[PDB]
């Protein structure tokens, strides 16, 4: 019976889409190992295994004295715990059945699971906007969309894996609320919002898009009681729920990031009440009260909306979010945020590379949403038009754009297919119209196939390489592997006193803390720029002066990463200029000037022409110790640097306050021991 | 699937559902009317093979009894 | 004079309104007279402890809005707008949302 | 404004934003590069090769133009399906929108093959 | 163990089958009488 076949075909399509979504993310595990990638996921892993061992109340109170020595970090007060709670819950569920999976595997494979569930959430979210035939397309598109996979390959254990599931679930619940007008759906949307707020910092996007949608529905005059019930309930519940998270605190009430929602809430009340008085009074009896009441309550709001800002009692925009509103701010005001190349603006190339067909189909989904406007479709219009901008401001936010791009591309392709397939209803110029329809259907099938081959190629070649391991191919095409990062961290783990302090640049802090289990000075979450500057000043300063800082911070060891023997372009020598800038940024550092390290010509180089301060700083001396005598190549003189392509200028020297503790086989990682104070009170000169 | 969280019935959906059940029953009975005509056509083939009129007369009366019952149930 | 327009307001409202809606309009007045007085306290004695102030105040605003939503879902004049929702489902929803509210304010009162 | 008048503004905005004008403004590359000839002159270069993360000013407008032709082609076709339109126009609309849909896609795919030697290879 | 080439092939074939099946679904939808009564 027709209903059975429609149900069968829906089920089969959706189960294939789920299996594809899960399976396409396994490339990284098949090529190397079921191990955690990148730097940032290691903090999530350590905290997750903590929560899985110590229990919730000891994780929430948790204070960590192994990081940011001697300051320490309040962990539970400065984290979004939803990812960890999810992983711990799944871990305890599986262990209850004695499916005693290792927690590392649960973390590694957590992202594919939710990236499978998001395909069903996207199906229902599109079905409620259009019809099931569009939801099947949006599911099949979001299954493989490379922009999302780029953040969701197995082992990419970071919040962005869960955040887009909570986001689409919140949009589904909000769309249901606005369509239906029911307090039940509003409270379920409030709970979905609370879940998302616990799990990613991007929640401010929803608590700023929903008010704008309601405002647009007011300006168009579509605002009707369903929207009042939905908005005021979602607002009160999601506010008092979001304020629960200790890292969020009072920000939902005391920060200008959320005042757009409060302003729309108050204006909803004013509109809901004017709509009632205008319904009770006669015009000649209405108008006087109407103009008077507006001339009082508007004046009140116009005053308070100024006083709140002028007093500074409502906190201004945070530099991050403001850098999202003004692309120029961070590059002048926070060099840490500038230094992360993930914050560069997005070129057309990355839009094509990550989306292909969707870039062509998105304007058609918009044309449909504008052709058949409705109270729910204005939401998708606003989401699309806002993500199209914010993705252009900063590549990292392409993640937020990929879902709406898939939903709108699915609507567009669905409308094309269901348009032309009606002309093929022969079964129950006409031959020209039929051959036109057949040709257009074939062109659409072809495009949709090319999108599969593109997305699979991109997923295989670009976004599936690890970063805790380096790979090369020998002349026989065998994979050469360099493990030197793990070799060095394991040497630290076993052959150094358990209370030793390792100084490093803040990139590697999560790796040292996770793999070496040693105390560190600075860390990726740059919550204390003064301390990072105090480390940069010690790296940039001269070897006589840096010792006073290393002995001030009680350092035991220092670690540097040197690529010059292997061509690893990401070494600490390339980071040196940022270390100089950050070290000179504090007032205690004003002797550190970037213009001192450049040659008089205005270039940075380490060969004989290099600045006589560059050739004498601590970092240069740590990187190129003994290196000057290594025959780096057959056609090159000794001391050739594979990355600068330059013969180093200062080849022979002695270190005086450091001794070489371990240099890895390929010299990729070098660790020095800071010499204890001279036994006789002699000076080291 | 057995439990129902409902409070107010909608007798219009109940009618839309009972009508569908009865229409599937009627469709089955009609498919059995076609199947009875296939039985009867087989009985005519058997008659041509046998030249025995009693076979086909009994076929006719079984048709005009069972098909008649199906017609009556259809009309009810 | 505005007193006359107010008189022509109440002369209608008191005649036009079912008793189950006057009940709500008195409950809303109790809620509003509690919230306004909490506010007038907060800005007299001071913001500390902001936890408890903000919890009790949002509890008042929440109960007011949930009461207005009941006051609107049940109104027959809106049956053409909230299709598929019976008054009893609206009351079950009102108690669901009020249960979430009174749980979270009890998380935040302390 | 009417819905169509807003949609037109959104499409015109999509053109500029997809061409990466927010990259041009703050990174401010030139419209094209130049590279040494073997005889030592400079040949201009339209594409910053191998840099997927990089762009010249006119490269983005070229690509976004192809994207706009692709998006508008299906709008022309769906407009073309109306029964009032005299057929001699109708077969045209089925021509123009169809060649827009194909040629813009193929040229964009060739431009991306130019940006990344090794793309799909 | 399965290699990443066998996975890449398997995923290409799933993708093609999926989109061809959706392009069938649109026909099974539009041919429906009940969707247009």
Curated annotation (Swiss-Prot), chain A:
Q: Implicated in which disease?
A: Congenital disorder of glycosylation 1W, autosomal recessive: A form of congenital disorder of glycosylation, a multisystem disorder caused by a defect in glycoprotein biosynthesis and characterized by under-glycosylated serum glycoproteins. Congenital disorders of glycosylation result in a wide variety of clinical features, such as defects in the nervous system development, psychomotor retardation, dysmorphic features, hypotonia, coagulation disorders, and immunodeficiency. Congenital disorder of glycosylation 1W, autosomal dominant: A form of congenital disorder of glycosylation, a multisystem disorder caused by a defect in glycoprotein biosynthesis and characterized by under-glycosylated serum glycoproteins. Congenital disorders of glycosylation result in a wide variety of clinical features, such as defects in the nervous system development, psychomotor retardation, dysmorphic features, hypotonia, coagulation disorders, and immunodeficiency.
Organism of provenance: Homo sapiens
Q: Where is this site: Interacts with target acceptor peptide in protein substrate?
A: 40, 342, 575
Motif DK motif, chain ranges: 572-579
Reported impact of residue 322 to H: Confers resistance to inhibitor N-glycosylation inhibitor NGI-1
Instruction: Give the residue ranges of motif DXD motif 1.
Output: 38-40
Q: GO cellular-component terms in the record?
A: endoplasmic reticulum membrane; membrane; oligosaccharyltransferase complex; oligosaccharyltransferase complex A
Q: Name one GO molecular function term.
A: dolichyl-diphosphooligosaccharide-protein glycotransferase activity
Q: Where is this motif: SVSE motif?
A: 339-342
User: Keyword Transmembrane: yes or no?
Assistant: yes
Swiss-Prot record, chain B:
- Quaternary structure and interacting proteins, as annotated: Component of the oligosaccharyltransferase (OST) complex. OST exists in two different complex forms which contain common core subunits RPN1, RPN2, OST48, OST4, DAD1 and TMEM258, either STT3A or STT3B as catalytic subunits, and form-specific accessory subunits. STT3A complex assembly occurs through the formation of 3 subcomplexes. Subcomplex 1 contains RPN1 and TMEM258, subcomplex 2 contains the STT3A-specific subunits STT3A, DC2/OSTC, and KCP2 as well as the core subunit OST4, and subcomplex 3 contains RPN2, DAD1, and OST48.
Quote the gene name from the UniProt entry. RPN1
Q: In which tissues is it expressed?
A: Expressed in all tissues tested.
> Know the name of this protein?
Dolichyl-diphosphooligosaccharide--protein glycosyltransferase subunit 1
> What does the similarity note say?
Belongs to the OST1 family.
PTM per Swiss-Prot/TrEMBL = Ubiquitinated by the ECS(ASB11) complex. Ubiquitinated by RNF128, leading to degradation in a proteasome/lysosome-dependent manner. Ufmylated by UFL1 in response to endoplasmic reticulum stress, promoting reticulophagy of endoplasmic reticulum sheets.
Species source reads Homo sapiens
Q: Where in the cell is it found?
A: Endoplasmic reticulum membrane; Melanosome
Which portion of the complete protein is shown here?
A: 457 to 532 of 607
UniProtKB/Swiss-Prot annotation, chain C:
One GO BP: negative regulation of apoptotic process
Its subcellular locations are: Endoplasmic reticulum membrane
Does this entry carry the keyword Cell cycle? Answer: no
A single GO cellular-component term from the record reads:
endoplasmic reticulum membrane
Instruction: Name any one GO molecular function.
Output: enzyme activator activity
User: Has keyword Cell cycle?
Assistant: no
Q: How does the protein associate with the membrane?
A: Multi-pass membrane protein
- Family label: Belongs to the DAD/OST2 family.
- Role: Subunit of the oligosaccharyl transferase (OST) complex that catalyzes the initial transfer of a defined glycan (Glc(3)Man(9)GlcNAc(2) in eukaryotes) from the lipid carrier dolichol-pyrophosphate to an asparagine residue within an Asn-X-Ser/Thr consensus motif in nascent polypeptide chains, the first step in protein N-glycosylation. N-glycosylation occurs cotranslationally and the complex associates with the Sec61 complex at the channel-forming translocon complex that mediates protein translocation across the endoplasmic reticulum (ER). All subunits are required for a maximal enzyme activity.
Name the record gives this protein? Dolichyl-diphosphooligosaccharide--protein glycosyltransferase subunit DAD1
The organism is Homo sapiens (Human)
- Lineage, broadest ranks: Eukaryota, Metazoa, Chordata, Craniata, Vertebrata
UniProtKB/Swiss-Prot annotation, chain E:
What SUPFAM superfamilies does this protein's entry cite?
Oligosaccharyltransferase subunit ost4p (SSF103464)
Q: Which parts of the chain does the record assign to the membrane side Cytoplasmic?
A: 26-37
* Topological domains, Lumenal: 1-4
| Gene behind the chain | OST4
Chief location category: endoplasmic reticulum
Question: Where is the protein localized?
Answer: Endoplasmic reticulum; Endoplasmic reticulum membrane
Q: Does the keyword Membrane apply?
A: yes
List the protein's name: Dolichyl-diphosphooligosaccharide--protein glycosyltransferase subunit 4
Any GO BP annotation? protein N-linked glycosylation
Q: How does it sit in the membrane?
A: Single-pass type III membrane protein
Keywords carried by this UniProt record:
Endoplasmic reticulum, Membrane, Signal-anchor, Transmembrane, Transmembrane helix
